[PDB]
Design an enzyme around this catalytic site. Sequence first.
Site: not given
Ligand SMILES: Nc1ncnc2c1ncn2[C@@H]1O[C@H](COP(=O)(O)OP(=O)(O)O)[C@@H](O)[C@H]1O
Ligand SMILES: [Mg+2]
Lengths: 163, 470, 96, 90, 49
Positions: B158, B184-185
């Site tokens: 997301k 957010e963080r």
């Molecule tokens: N296009 C992409 N290719 C590879 N990994 C991805 C991609 N988009 C997101 N990710 C992975 O998804 C994870 C999302 O982490 P985070 O943002 O903390 O959780 P959320 O997406 O639920 O908020 C990241 O650690 C990232 O490595």
């Molecule tokens: Mg996020």
Amino acid sequence: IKPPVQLFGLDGTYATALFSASAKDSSIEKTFQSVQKLSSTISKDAKVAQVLSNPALSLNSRKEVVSVLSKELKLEPVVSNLLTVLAENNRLSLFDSIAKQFSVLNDAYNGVVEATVVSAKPLDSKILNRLTKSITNSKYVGPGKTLKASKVNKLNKVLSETI
Amino acid sequence: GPASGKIRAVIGAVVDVQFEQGELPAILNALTIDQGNNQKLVLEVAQHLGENAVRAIAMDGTEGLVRGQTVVDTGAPISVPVGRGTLGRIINVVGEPIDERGPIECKQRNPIHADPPSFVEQSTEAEVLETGIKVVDLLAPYARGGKIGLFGGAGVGKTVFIQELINNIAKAHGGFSVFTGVGERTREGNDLYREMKETGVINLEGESKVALVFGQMNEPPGARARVALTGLTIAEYFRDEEGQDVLLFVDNIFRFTQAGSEVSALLGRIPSAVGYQPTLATDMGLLQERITTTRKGSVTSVQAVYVPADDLTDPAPATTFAHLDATTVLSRGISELGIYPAVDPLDSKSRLLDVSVVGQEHYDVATGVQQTLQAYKSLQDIIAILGMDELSEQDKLTVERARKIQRFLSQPFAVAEVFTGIEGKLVRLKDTIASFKAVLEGKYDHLPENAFYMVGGIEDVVAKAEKIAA
Amino acid sequence: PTEVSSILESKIRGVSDEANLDETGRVLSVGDGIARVFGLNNCQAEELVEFASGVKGMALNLEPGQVGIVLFGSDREVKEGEIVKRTGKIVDVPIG
Amino acid sequence: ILESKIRGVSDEANLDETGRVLSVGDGIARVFGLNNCQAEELVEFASGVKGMALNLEPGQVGIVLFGSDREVKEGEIVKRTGKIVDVPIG
Amino acid sequence: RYEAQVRQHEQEQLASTVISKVQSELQNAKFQDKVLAQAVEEVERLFAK
Ligand SMILES: Nc1ncnc2c1ncn2[C@@H]1O[C@H](COP(=O)(O)OP(=O)(O)O)[C@@H](O)[C@H]1O
Ligand SMILES: [Mg+2]
């Protein structure tokens, strides 16, 4: 005898319960001045207020403190039985609600109430309310009435709704 | 002399103020409480309990307040700075700057609580917005000036989906941006401000075009629920008083409903479904209706929703799906397979997916790609138990084409280059429609399934198959 | 047609001339759409209520000491002690 | 003024920085008093158990005990520490 | 649409100027407004009794 004044049903029934026994042999006039001395000597005193509002003491300690203060104040008739019922049932924290509901019974069955505009009205003790409000509104509007609104707010709201 | 009150009750975020005079404060009134840090304490009025007492909600920590403190009333709501002075600065929920760059020299200060647009001031359109992703330009296309929803669970994608779209659409939009982060963080706020300054979005010594609003999860419940109203007030002034296509980016939008549910139990309200507040549809509808396109200007809302424990039937996820033109659901099952991102084609839908807006060529390619993925998903019970050899001749060819079409729509973003290792691919709208129609007709059936995973259009799929066979 | 603003001012001239007969109450508590009005003994169930600020209300819960009325708009202008007048009719709407 | 010395029930309880325990149970302690006690402040019971005043309404204050429920009874004297829930560091 | 917007803007501007003149006249201590308010209350109470 229950008068038609409602006054809640649970919390407001404290002053209405003692009014049935006080309405015999003309004992309603002395109960008005005796109820005001119990609240004035506890609020603006800072002595018996903190020693009675806590959840300590006991059943015999609460009854002895009310009998000692009533022997030197203004209580000798049925005023001593009102404080003993609130001490065993843990009802001494709301002493202002029992004294305020007792004065509303004498002002409803022997006078008017409600309001009108600005401050208070007159609250006459005649009979009907139609013949007493018309004779008191003309004498109160001329004398005083600083007027410090209702007709100007209604005219501005009607013009904005049609535009 | 203003209206002064006394604190009678204090339970967490709720603080009941007892006014001694008859002129009590109204609802949504900003209260001032003196302390000892040159910042005082903000407090928003919620309801009135009667007997010259109103229950207010503090916007900060209530630790240190005693019974009987002086609470002055400002006479209005929580105002914030609007205009061109808020671009490039980091504002908070009360409109104060948190970027340590002095005060915001704004001409006017509008309140955070305001009514939305009426039925006669609305303006609907059907302009498509090209994002660059292969799974978004063909399946659920976004609309210009509408509300975009990025639903997903924890760890699905997301936060990475909102960062990749802002670096390829907001950089050449022309209008001003509005990145208001709620819930957010702590590390996400500092990394977003440093990346936008090196690319030309937020210039501290020049001209900026992106408004930043602070408000992470480290604050109390009153600041998280009021973070959405402070960020939406700055974007509404640029589209009504100035007439510019603003871009509201909320991350995340699910933190506005979760912050009010923790303070609803102390205000006297009964709990609803899953321990939520009773006014869930009334509080969410009053803020989402104001972030729409009017006759004076448009407002492209690109918020992101958070699924509660990977559940789309929750009270905070299902209620936000009726106020968005385009939805982007991110399933947790496709993220573990290797799809970047996990764009679910069977759940993402939009209102611009028609033949009168995208054409007859784009409408036939979207229906053919969705029909092949639905047939392979329904027959997953026989392929995982009996195997792939139990199918017929027509079912064997449809299962091979559905696997290559699912990996071709996952393109590597430019912001995820450190986690994937490949370069960023930005396919156009015309190149994505021609690549999906040629693979479904039988022109790319001889290629492997790994040649289309993490690629671009039809040009990158032919170059990856020749290098792997050498 | 020939000063259209003058026709609207002459028709909305005399209107407020019979609105001095009480028929109001007092609001004790309000918030989150609900509004606990104290009084109004002649108010029937599901009746249209009009507050002093201009917001409409509908008395759906009638108790013995108070009366729970649901506001049909925003509760930002309604406070404690406001007059809640009764229209005398039920929740009606236009037709035709 | 005449009803102050006529009572005789020890009318000298300092309720500004202390309070009486009205009820105790389920890890909570309803203290009656402590008007100058701030929110989320540390407290001390008569037996030595620490407490944290969470909710402070009118006339009562919900103190959360950090120990067993047997170290707090009805009518005990609960004093205030003057500070919040802090701990040692360094 | 331009003729209807010009007529609505002229009517809204004339209503705002008439509302400001009525509020300024009441704040100038009108002796005719105070005498007419007392006579209207006595005539309404006599018709209902
Ligand atoms: N296009 C992409 N290719 C590879 N990994 C991805 C991609 N988009 C997101 N990710 C992975 O998804 C994870 C999302 O982490 P985070 O943002 O903390 O959780 P959320 O997406 O639920 O908020 C990241 O650690 C990232 O490595
Ligand atoms: Mg996020």
